[PDB]
Design an enzyme around this catalytic site. Structure first.
Site, mmCIF file in Angstrom:
data_model
loop_
_atom_site.group_PDB
_atom_site.id
_atom_site.type_symbol
_atom_site.label_atom_id
_atom_site.label_comp_id
_atom_site.label_asym_id
_atom_site.label_seq_id
_atom_site.Cartn_x
_atom_site.Cartn_y
_atom_site.Cartn_z
ATOM 1 N N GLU A 1 0.798 -1.224 0.000
ATOM 2 C CA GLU A 1 0.000 0.000 0.000
ATOM 3 C C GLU A 1 0.827 1.268 0.000
ATOM 4 O O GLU A 1 1.783 1.433 0.787
ATOM 5 C CB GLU A 1 -0.935 0.017 1.215
ATOM 6 N N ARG B 1 -18.548 -1.402 4.691
ATOM 7 C CA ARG B 1 -19.572 -2.042 3.866
ATOM 8 C C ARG B 1 -20.295 -3.150 4.626
ATOM 9 O O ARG B 1 -21.459 -3.444 4.355
ATOM 10 C CB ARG B 1 -18.940 -2.636 2.608
ATOM 11 N N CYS C 1 -8.551 -2.658 7.653
ATOM 12 C CA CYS C 1 -7.162 -2.662 7.189
ATOM 13 C C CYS C 1 -6.605 -1.254 6.991
ATOM 14 O O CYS C 1 -5.517 -0.939 7.473
ATOM 15 C CB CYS C 1 -7.021 -3.477 5.897
ATOM 16 N N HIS D 1 -1.273 -6.277 1.507
ATOM 17 C CA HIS D 1 -2.467 -7.119 1.382
ATOM 18 C C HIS D 1 -2.165 -8.422 0.629
ATOM 19 O O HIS D 1 -1.448 -8.423 -0.379
ATOM 20 C CB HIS D 1 -3.590 -6.392 0.618
HETATM 21 CL CL LIG Z 1 -11.352 -9.501 1.680
HETATM 22 CL CL LIG Z 2 -15.668 -1.350 3.685
#
Ligand SMILES: [Cl-]
Ligand SMILES: [Cl-]
Ligand SMILES: [Cl-]
Ligand SMILES: [Cl-]
Ligand SMILES: [Cl-]
Ligand SMILES: [Cl-]
Ligand SMILES: [Cl-]
Ligand SMILES: [Cl-]
Ligand SMILES: [Cl-]
Ligand SMILES: [Cl-]
Ligand SMILES: [Cl-]
Ligand SMILES: [Cl-]
Ligand SMILES: [Cl-]
Ligand SMILES: [Cl-]
Ligand SMILES: [Cl-]
Lengths: 205, 209, 211, 205
Positions: free
Chosen positions: B83, B93, B146, B170
């Site tokens: 990242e 979400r 994350c 990741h």
């Molecule tokens: Cl995931």
């Molecule tokens: Cl999210």
């Protein structure tokens, strides 16, 4: 009793072909009283088929599984059907680039795989390996070989079952950075071992 | 003679109903490694907003690392991603493991909008690619736990131990996770662990890009 | 000599399916109703999204209109462009039930029919005509294993058995924008672009006997 | 009362840029008591921001929306955040290819969009137009402009809201047969119209 497993040499600018790398450790292996024989065939229209026929006639297998690279696919794919057409997006390894020509003149439009494809896909998935049935093997040398195999078996030895499995890129091939998926060599060999064993143990779906 | 230094590697608990998190499985074999003058210490962080950060701060204080690399799973990605930047926003979400689902809230109130990773990210990506492992720089760590942890890490190091470099990596789905319907890419656990070894070693040995 | 009957192009599309309330295949060909091109009139027919029943309706339409060219249209949600199908295969394998609740698993479309039929449309010329008009399009090697492939196969078989000079084939359209609004990064094409594409594809098919 | 909307000229090898084509019909239209003014800016690092700076100083907008092409995306995207970095995958239109340099030296790492991005995405989706919030505007000229815009407004006129919207390829750009998604010009223009009006009428999210 012999299972014949084929794969291809590198093509399309690649330096390696995962189909060949993945089947090499399977040579000589026993599958419940059958033994595996491997054969590398050139990624060349028509010449590939001559190598295939020669291998089939030499080993007289009860089961034939041909393997190829499907770069961009995310999982192991077991092919449902071969179609009677060559339509090359790129040249083969000898520079041939046929456009809409038959694999076998006056052969039928298609042959279904004679492998228990659903049973194979389910065995892979149950083992934690992503797999699916594919409805197209393309129109390059892989489909060409799948069609030629099925036609040859139907014309000469109908009780012998043939079919095709595609593997994805190896990680080392996906480095080129077009956001391409891969599967390790170790996983590919395991998947093929399971698929071949499953096909041998199960005559039909 | 010289002191051994410490590299802290973090990963997460499973989330969203999964029984495993490969970020944790991938770093477990690294625990207790004594390599290139460094002790590798690992720590599992709860996948919970804010609580994750408290666990992170406690781990940093405990191990006093000279390098921190946090790892998480990004199902759907095709390769290993390192990242570039953490942003100061939570936008969930799905709920976290404690049922929290923050929408557009800051990670740290009145913190800066973002922190760039302090890892040599191009060097790490190149080392992975050269070793035959697909990898790329990512410009978004998402807006879930994350990214929250990446941001909180970089803010905490900046405020308390500025010479300590932090960042985030990741991993994609494991093959067993990609079995579900859909065209999802995967990477084996063994390949993940190898990739993390290379990334960590490269980060340790290269102070800048 | 006088009152020479025009030739007929039959264009078919489906009922809505899979829980959708619209099928863009039908919405896209509705404006072609009552139209003509190069001496041929266009006739459209909406067919049920039901295994076997769909084919019954298709055969009835073909017998009724006695078309010289047949193009069947369906929706392929997820595709990015207009696709012209190369080949129909003799299998039903339903991921979801049809509109009447049928979910056949690996059954033939026609028992003892050939494994496949190639499209008889000039598919490369159609794709190129779309592309040069600025409309993304490609040849597809699979029409799926649901009702669209089922209809493509049955059409090609019926024409082969009964009127072999008659050319048939299949075109898939993608999702409409409204259908792609759901989560999941789905590609789409507007209805207006779909209708334009089908017009070009049909005109090209009618005017070109071969690739 | 002037809403300012910007777009780019063609870049890479492209013959057209959908961002410019899409906003032309919007010129001079009123939106609930405001006028839209449009401006084309070159796809060139730093030179782009000068044109932008000039245009903001000229029309004195209460709202600024910059638009660009995101080839490959399937939908309309409204950007959440701009980051202080240039990292060019390809050269810009002047041959510059900066690698990891700041947009503004000693500016902050990022600026969040000041547009009501969730309300805009919701309005589009409700209108039957696929749209989503994006967390990255890239590291090419589009992000470079988004960042420079947000920095400029924050330093001079904090009440003025700025942000960025990406459009996908036009159909004519997706013909290349690389399986690329597209959106018609007509749909893009409507999407931008709705997004801009929504931005204007809703000060918060
Ligand atoms: Cl995931
Ligand atoms: Cl999210
Ligand atoms: Cl090809
Ligand atoms: Cl099944
Ligand atoms: Cl192909
Ligand atoms: Cl891929
Ligand atoms: Cl490997
Ligand atoms: Cl990214
Ligand atoms: Cl694994
Ligand atoms: Cl493994
Ligand atoms: Cl009917
Ligand atoms: Cl529409
Ligand atoms: Cl770039
Ligand atoms: Cl970029
Ligand atoms: Cl257009």
């Amino acid at each position: 009793k012999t299972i014949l497993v084929t794969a291809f040499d590198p093509f399309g600018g690649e330096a390696i072909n995962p189909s060949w790398e993945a089947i090499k450790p399977l040579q000589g292996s026993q599958v419940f009283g059958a033994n595996i024989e491997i054969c590398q065939i050139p990624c060349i229209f028509d010449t590939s088929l001559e190598h295939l026929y020669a291998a089939v006639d030499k080993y007289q297998p009860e089961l034939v599984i041909s393997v190829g690279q499907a770069g961009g696919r995310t999982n192991i794919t077991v092919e449902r059907v071969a179609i009677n057409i060559n339509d090359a997006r790129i040249p083969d390894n000898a520079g041939n680039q046929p456009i809409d020509t038959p694999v076998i003149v006056d052969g039928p439009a298609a042959y279904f795989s004679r492998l228990p494809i659903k049973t194979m896909v389910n065995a892979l998935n149950t083992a934690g390996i992503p797999a699916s049935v594919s409805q197209t093997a393309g129109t390059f040398v892989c489909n060409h070989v799948m069609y030629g195999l099925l036609h040859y078996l139907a014309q000469n030895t109908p009780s012998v079952r043939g079919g095709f499995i595609h593997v994805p890129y190896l990680p080392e091939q996906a480095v080129k950075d077009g956001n391409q998926s891969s599967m390790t060599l170790m996983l590919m060999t395991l998947a093929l071992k399971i698929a071949i064993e499953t096909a041998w143990k199960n005559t039909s779906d």
